[PDB]
RNA sequence: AGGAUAGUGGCCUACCAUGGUUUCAACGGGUAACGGGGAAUAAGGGUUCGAUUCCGGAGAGGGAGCCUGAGAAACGGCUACCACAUCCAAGGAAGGCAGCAGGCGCGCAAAUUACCCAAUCCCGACACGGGGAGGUAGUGACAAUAAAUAACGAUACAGGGCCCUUUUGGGUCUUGUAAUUGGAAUGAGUACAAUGUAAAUACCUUAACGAGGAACAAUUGGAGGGCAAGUCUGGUGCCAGCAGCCGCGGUAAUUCCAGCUCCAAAAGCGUAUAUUAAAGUUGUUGCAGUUAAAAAGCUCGUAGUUGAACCUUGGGCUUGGCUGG
């Protein structure tokens, strides 16, 4: 079509943004960045639709042009910057630190974290290979390139990023029993431990995950993010709900008792 | 089939119909009021002739 | 065995046989052959404008005896000539030669109605003014 | 009635982070006076036909019309 | 362009236009509830016709089915909430037994007349349309406003109405002011 | 094997084989054919539609060829030809609304040459500029929602309802009639004003004004049947006309033209065309083929469709989760 698209129709935007139909014709098209278009959250949506700090798109640009917003310890002024899973957003004017972790309803939760926890992040290792001059490197889920990794680190593992120097503190090998959050599919946001990894050469490997309520679901390996060395030991603070999916009848019962 | 004929008699009956003006009668009620009028007329003051019920009885 | 195949793998025979036999439905033939597009004087439209050629009058069919007062109209869109009935007592006097009339069908969907022979259309408007408005003296003909 | 309200820490802060039309409502600013959109667009397209300075363009156009 | 805005029809007409049994039943039913026209009767029948369709689908499912339990209880609860269904008939078999007069009982027009605030049902509609009746602290001028059970006790004259402690109306002010 | 491409590849070339598709419908023709998400109708099964708010594709009068660039065979870029077509001082020059608005033509068929970047977003060197993208208003009975056009009294007069009662005569409370009588209530409209908005309009609130024939006056179709509602009155007299169909009209026409009355739906109602259900009149569910339409004159026969029965059963032992009670 003669070139890249630059617009995003409101109806064609990712559904987890929870945008309303009648507010306009278009939706924010996320810029190119560390995270994929379909799996990101532009900062305009976060500052106006989620926190409701800004009343409109003019105000979110005013906020970011005064150098308030930092992503992963660096000031960002791109209103459509594609923030994604495990990214850290810092607003030192409000003294708030957020981490983008999926909640069990499939959306990006407003998950506040402590300043101590905001000093690092986790990244899923996509590939390990040798660069020029024979230097090995690791590519994380947010496009980071870390040189000289621990030689035991392989793909589908999770590394702990120092997030100020970009180095690896330590890692978690992908194996049975590791704590996992699902980052894709209809089981998105659920948290459990690996029960069984089912291999399919030439196809898609499937992972069996057990919920804290001993509910079992299956999802693709590309949607699996290792977040802990074992059950009940996540390396980052989980959002409210701890990633356990309840049925609608259970949710109705819980809501009745709460109110 | 054969098609032809004199056109001189077009509008014959309507032209020679004697013009009669409408008597300036009371307006009928509109909307909910008209439904109220019809309901009573058919279920409150019934005008049946011992099983012979007519909406528009001609004078006879 | 009811004279038609019943096997679970005989869907092609069933599909082709039904497809062949819907051609016996004349309603179906006209939709796919496009006969309204090709043969109908209106070309498939509901209405069509035209110019009045002459006032003539059509004798009714038996056992009725009357002069159905019609006009000869040449359609603007394709130049075809059709006969159109002029409804109501005396509305032929509202229609003159070389007037622009809006036509519509008689409602029998391509067949003649009643005792009127060979007429499938009726006059709706003349000179851009409704014939009913002229008949009830709601409007006057612009002339 | 229901509405929305903002309170700034100072008038200076308010004048910086406010839309122009609200300051005009409160009398804190003057409505900017500009030509209509038709005039601005027509003038922009008229200037598109001139390469270089306007002074050079009108002097050269003037030279052609020896009148 | 902008996303389309959804809309739908809220009634359906009978298949046979002329039927003395249905015409007499409708007029008898319109006269009892002071309805403006037959469309207000078609509207109740339309939404009741689709209530039955929803109930039939759940009734074909096995008992203790998750969808039947969740949506069936919610539909019953909603019907109990507006006072159409009695508290002792929450079985989804009495839902099929509902009748249009059950729905017309819960209209604002019916409740104003039945609470004694009006002389007749036709006085109720004009009182509603003329901004005299308030539910809670909110003026409601829609006769078809369906009264909830918890809103039933809060139907009274508007606080700014001549009949409910407000000032005298336009007509009285012109007479007593001369 | 090479060339070319960003790259695979008969994509192209050289040399060489004779292959490739097809009754499981190739190839060709038609399409009043852009595909899909979806729309109408729908017991089920279905039938019809999808130019059009989103996604993908294609095009910028018709072809073809290119420059720049990461990206275009781009057309609000160029080059050339064809068809249209503009100015000219006659030497020459300049074009592309299937962008917005608007005009002509075409037609049964579709709105303003309006305001603005305030919202939604996009572009740029960018906190600032630009955006007929977009938003706002205008026209707008395309469709959709809610919903006025009156309500209540008082008397009169009648009937029922009761009661004082045998009826009689009354007291008296529920309806119906009132050119038979009132005082209340309100928004349509208008309006200070505030709100609304970029600025307005409108909406929403709200002073003052704003309803008796409350002329602030509801219409569209019908009244033989189908199909609800006239054997009323006048006119015409196989004429005029009505009539989807059956039929009506020749001097009291239940059908025409009118008046009265009545019926149906109502801010909507009628007509034309298409389509769906009704249609078990396309039938897989689920039609018919002696005589209503319909078994090839008779056998053979390829593809197609369809094809007898049969191979670990029974028994025993423990065994969990649930469902009466
Ligand atoms: Mg990246
Ligand atoms: Mg990053
Ligand atoms: Mg058909
Ligand atoms: Mg006949
Ligand atoms: Mg005309
Ligand atoms: Mg310039
Ligand atoms: Mg310039
Ligand atoms: Mg009746
Ligand atoms: Mg090769
Ligand atoms: Mg190649
Ligand atoms: Mg086409
Ligand atoms: Mg199509
Ligand atoms: Mg069906
Ligand atoms: Mg479509
Ligand atoms: Mg389409
Ligand atoms: Mg077309
Ligand atoms: Mg459309
Ligand atoms: Mg498109
Ligand atoms: Mg193109
Ligand atoms: Mg064109
Ligand atoms: Mg373009
Ligand atoms: Mg081109
Ligand atoms: Mg153009
Ligand atoms: Mg245009
Ligand atoms: Mg139109
Ligand atoms: Mg126009
Ligand atoms: Mg608007
Ligand atoms: Mg009116
Ligand atoms: Mg007004
Ligand atoms: Mg006004
Ligand atoms: Mg203002
Ligand atoms: Mg009428
Ligand atoms: Mg008549
Ligand atoms: Mg009848
Ligand atoms: Mg019939
Ligand atoms: Mg006579
Ligand atoms: Mg007579
Ligand atoms: Mg007579
Ligand atoms: Mg009769
Ligand atoms: Mg008739
Ligand atoms: Mg009605
Ligand atoms: Mg059926
Ligand atoms: Mg047939
Ligand atoms: Mg048969
Ligand atoms: Mg048959
Ligand atoms: Mg025979
Ligand atoms: Mg034989
Ligand atoms: Mg043969
Ligand atoms: Mg077998």
Contact present, C79 and C43 (Cβ < 8 Å) = no
Integer Cα distance of A10 and A13 in angstroms: 6
Write out residues 16-45 of A within 8 Å (CB-CB) of E: 21-22, 24-25
Distance in Å, residue C31 CA to nucleotide F1 C1': 59
Integer Cα distance of A137 and A175 in angstroms: 21
Integer Cα distance of A159 and A149 in angstroms: 9
What is the Cα C79 distance to its own chain's centre? 16
Q: Half-sphere exposure of residue A197, counting CA atoms within 13 Å on the CB side?
A: 15
Measure the CA dihedral A33/A39/A45/A47, to 10°. -70
Contact present, C58 and C116 (Cβ < 8 Å) = yes
Q: Do E66 and A252 touch (CB under 8 A)?
A: no
CA angle A169, A173, A179 (to 5 degrees): 95
Helix H, strand E, coil C: the string for E108-160 is: HHHHHHHCCCCCCHHHHHHHHHCCCEEECCEECCCCCCECCCCCHHHEEECCC
Whether nucleic acid strand F comes within 7 Å of the CB of C125, the answer is no
C-alpha closest to that of E126 among E161, E84, E165, E79: E161
Strand partners, C105: C121
> How many Cβ atoms sit within 10 Å of the Cβ of residue C138?
10
Contact present, A244 and A198 (Cβ < 8 Å) = no
Distance in Å, residue D66 CA to nucleotide F80 C1': 39
Which positions in strand F are less than 7 Å from the protein's CB atoms?
Answer: 24, 32, 48-49, 53-58, 70-75, 106-109, 114-123, 127-128, 130-135, 143-153, 175-177, 179, 183-187, 195-199, 206, 208-211, 213-215, 217-218, 221, 223, 227-232, 234-236, 238-250, 256-267, 271-275, 281-285, 287-289, 295, 304-307
Whether nucleic acid strand F comes within 7 Å of the CB of A21, the answer is no
Integer Cα distance of A158 and A173 in angstroms: 7
Integer Cα distance of A68 and A75 in angstroms: 7
Integer Cα distance of B37 and B45 in angstroms: 11
> How many Cβ atoms sit within 10 Å of the Cβ of residue E66?
11
- Axis crossing angle, helix E39-60 with helix E66-81, rounded to the nearest 10: 150
- The two three-digit tokens of residue A108, written as one number: 């990006």
Whether nucleic acid strand F comes within 7 Å of the CB of C63, the answer is yes
| Gaps in chain A after residue (C–N beyond 2.5 Å) | none
Contact present, A127 and A141 (Cβ < 8 Å) = no
Contact present, E164 and E132 (Cβ < 8 Å) = yes
- Round to the nearest angstrom and report the end-to-end CA distance of chain D: 69
Q: Do A58 and D19 touch (CB under 8 A)?
A: yes
- The two three-digit tokens of residue B46, written as one number: 């019934």
Contact present, A189 and A243 (Cβ < 8 Å) = yes
Distance in Å, residue C19 CA to nucleotide F299 C1': 31
In window 27-56 of C, residues with CB < 7 A from nucleic chain F are 27, 30-31, 33-34, 36-38, 44-49
Chain C: residue whose CA lies nearest to B5: C57
Integer Cα distance of A203 and A221 in angstroms: 11
The position carrying tokens 């679901």 is A217
What secondary structure does DSSP assign to A138-180, as a single string?
A: EE-TTS-EEES--TT--TT-EEEE-SSS--EEEEE---TT-EE
Integer Cα distance of A13 and C83 in angstroms: 58
C-alpha closest to that of E112 among E64, E170, E174, E161: E161
Contact present, A34 and A161 (Cβ < 8 Å) = no
- The two three-digit tokens of residue A69, written as one number: 């917003």
- Round to the nearest angstrom and report the end-to-end CA distance of chain E: 60
**A234: which DSSP letter?**
B
What secondary structure does DSSP assign to A14-49, as a single string?
A: -GGG---STT-SB---PPSSSS-STT-EEHHIIIII
Q: How does strand A69-71 pair with strand A74-75? A: antiparallel
Integer Cα distance of B40 and B5 in angstroms: 55
- The two three-digit tokens of residue A39, written as one number: 């799996």
Strands of A96-99's sheet, edge to edge? A74-75, A69-71, A88-91, A96-99, A111-112
- Return phi, psi of residue E119, to 5°: -75, -40
Is A167 exposed, middle or buried (CB count within 10 Å of its CB: 0-12, 13-18, 19+)?
Answer: middle
């Amino acid at each position: 079509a003669r070139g890249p698209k630059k617009h995003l129709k409101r109806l064609a935007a990712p559904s987890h943004w929870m945008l309303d139909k009648l507010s306009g014709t278009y939706a924010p098209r996320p810029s190119a960045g560390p995270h994929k278009l379909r799996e990101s959250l532009p900062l305009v949506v976060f500052l106006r639709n989620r926190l409701k700090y800004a009343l409109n798109g003019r105000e979110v640009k005013a906020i970011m042009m005064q150098q308030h917003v930092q992503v992963d310890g660096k000031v960002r002024t791109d209103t459509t910057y594609p923030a994604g899973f495990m990214d850290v957003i810092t607003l030192e004017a409000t003294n708030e630190h957020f981490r983008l972790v999926y909640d069990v309803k499939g959306k990006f939760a407003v998950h506040r974290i402590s300043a101590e926890e905001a000093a690092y992040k986790l990244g899923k290792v996509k590939k390990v290979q040798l660069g020029k001059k024979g230097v090995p490197y690791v590519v994380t889920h947010d496009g980071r390139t870390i040189r000289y990794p621990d030689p035991l680190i392989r793909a589908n593992d999770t590394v702990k990023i120092d997030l100020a120097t970009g180095k690896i503190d330590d890692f978690i090998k992908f194996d049975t029993g590791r704590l996992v959050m699902v980052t894709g599919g209809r089981n998105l946001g659920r948290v459990g431990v690996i029960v069984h990894r089912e291999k399919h050469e030439g196809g898609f490997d499937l992972v069996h995950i057990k919920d804290a309520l001993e509910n079992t679901f299956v999802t693709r390996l590309s949607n699996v993010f290792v977040i802990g060395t074992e059950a009940g030991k996540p390396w980052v603070s989980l959002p409210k709900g701890k990633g356990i999916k309840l049925s609608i009848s259970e949710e109705r019962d819980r809501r009745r008792a709460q109110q | 089939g054969k098609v032809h004929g004199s056109l001189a008699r077009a509008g014959k009956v309507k032209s020679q119909t004697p013009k009669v003006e409408k008597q300036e009668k009371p307006k009928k009620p509109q909307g909910r009021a008209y439904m109220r009028l019809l309901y009573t007329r058919r279920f409150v003051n019934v005008t049946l002739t011992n099983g012979k019920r007519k909406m528009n009885p001609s004078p006879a | 065995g009811k004279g038609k195949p019943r096997g679970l793998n005989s869907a092609r025979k069933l599909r082709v046989h039904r497809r062949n036999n819907r051609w016996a439905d004349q309603a179906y033939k006209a939709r796919l052959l496009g006969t309204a597009f090709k043969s109908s004087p209106f070309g498939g439209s509901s209405h069509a404008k035209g110019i009045v050629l002459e006032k003539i009058g059509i004798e009714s069919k038996q056992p009725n005896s009357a002069i159905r007062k019609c006009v000869r109209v040449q359609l603007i869109k394709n130049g075809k000539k059709v006969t159109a009935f002029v409804p109501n007592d005396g509305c032929l006097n509202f229609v003159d030669e070389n007037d622009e009339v809006l036509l519509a069908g008689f409602g029998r969907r391509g067949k003649a109605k009643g005792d009127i022979p060979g007429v499938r259309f009726k006059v709706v408007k003349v000179s851009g003014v409704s014939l009913l408005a002229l008949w009830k003296e709601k409007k006057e003909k612009p002339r | 009635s229901t509405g929305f309200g903002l309170i700034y820490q100072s008038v200076a802060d308010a004048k910086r982070f406010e839309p122009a039309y609200r300051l005009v409502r409160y009398g804190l600013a003057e409505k900017v006076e500009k030509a209509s959109r038709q005039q601005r667009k027509q003038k922009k397209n008229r200037d598109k036909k001139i390469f270089g300075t306007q002074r050079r363009a009108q002097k050269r156009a003037a030279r052609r019309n020896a009148d | 362009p902008r996303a389309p805005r959804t809309y739908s029809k809220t009634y359906s007409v009978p298949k046979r236009p002329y039927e003395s049994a249905r015409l007499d039943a409708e007029l008898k039913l319109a006269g009892e509830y002071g309805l403006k026209n037959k469309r207000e009767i078609y509207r109740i029948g339309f939404q009741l016709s689709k209530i039955r369709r929803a109930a039939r689908d759940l009734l074909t499912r096995d008992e203790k089915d998750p969808k039947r339990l969740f949506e069936g209880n919610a539909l019953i609860r909603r019907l109990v909430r507006i006072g159409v269904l009695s508290e002792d008939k929450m079985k989804l078999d009495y839902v099929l037994a509902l009748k249009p007069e059950d729905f017309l009982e819960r209209r604002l027009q019916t409740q104003v007349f039945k609470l004694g605030l009006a002389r007749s049902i036709h006085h109720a509609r004009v009182l509603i349309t003329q901004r005299h009746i308030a539910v809670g602290k909110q003026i409601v001028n829609i006769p078809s406003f369906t009264v909830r059970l918890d809103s039933q006790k809060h139907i009274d004259f508007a606080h700014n109405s001549p009949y409910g402690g407000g000032r005298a109306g336009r007509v009285k002010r012109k007479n007593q002011g001369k």
